Amino acid sequence: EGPQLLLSEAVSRAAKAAGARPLTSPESLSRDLEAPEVQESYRQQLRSDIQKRLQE
Amino acid sequence: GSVWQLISKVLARHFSAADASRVLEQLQRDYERSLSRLTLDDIERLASRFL
Ligand SMILES: C[C@H](CCC(=O)NCCC[N+](C)(C)CCCS(=O)(=O)[O-])[C@H]1CC[C@H]2[C@@H]3[C@H](O)C[C@@H]4C[C@H](O)CC[C@]4(C)[C@H]3C[C@H](O)[C@]12C
């Protein structure tokens, strides 16, 4: 479809493709992925990379 | 420093060592494929969504 805007959904899809199941729970993993620092770093990476590919 | 490093600290709390590494590599691969498929059409549509 497109680049996943929500990091929690990106990780869920990655884990499913890798056949990885959490030691804890998907709910605990997702709570940690929503930490402001983690979400903000992801947003910034995304913004940087999109701009750079746009630079053609 | 990077988002990959922050994500890896989170993964180390919820996945075995082997699984955490596999998940990070799969995530980086999915991400880069997604960027590759990106077109001018998609970027334009993105701007309409938020502002
Ligand atoms: C990159 C574009 C803005 C384009 C722009 O403004 N600059 C392009 C200049 C092109 N040029 C004029 C140089 C062409 C020259 C041809 S010329 O006609 O000049 O000859 C902007 C528009 C909408 C923005 C996204 C959305 O917000 C949603 C989200 C918000 C997050 O926070 C950060 C991530 C994300 C995905 C954003 C990323 C990025 O930020 C986008 C795609």
Residue numbers in the entry:
A (entry chain B): 1058 to 1113
B (entry chain A): 93 to 143
What did the article's authors report about this structure?
BAG6 is an essential protein that functions in two distinct biological pathways, ubiquitin-mediated protein degradation of defective polypeptides and tail-anchored (TA) transmembrane protein biogenesis in mammals, although its structural and functional properties remain unknown. Recent work showed that BAG6 is also a mediator of tail-anchored (TA) transmembrane protein biogenesis. In the TA protein assembly pathway, BAG6 holds the hydrophobic transmembrane domain of newly synthesized TA proteins to maintain them in an unfolded but soluble state in the cytosol. Similarly, mammalian BAG6, Ubl4a, and SGTA make up a trimeric complex that binds TA proteins post-translationally and then loads them onto the cytosolic ATPase TRC40, which in turn targets them to the endoplasmic reticulum.
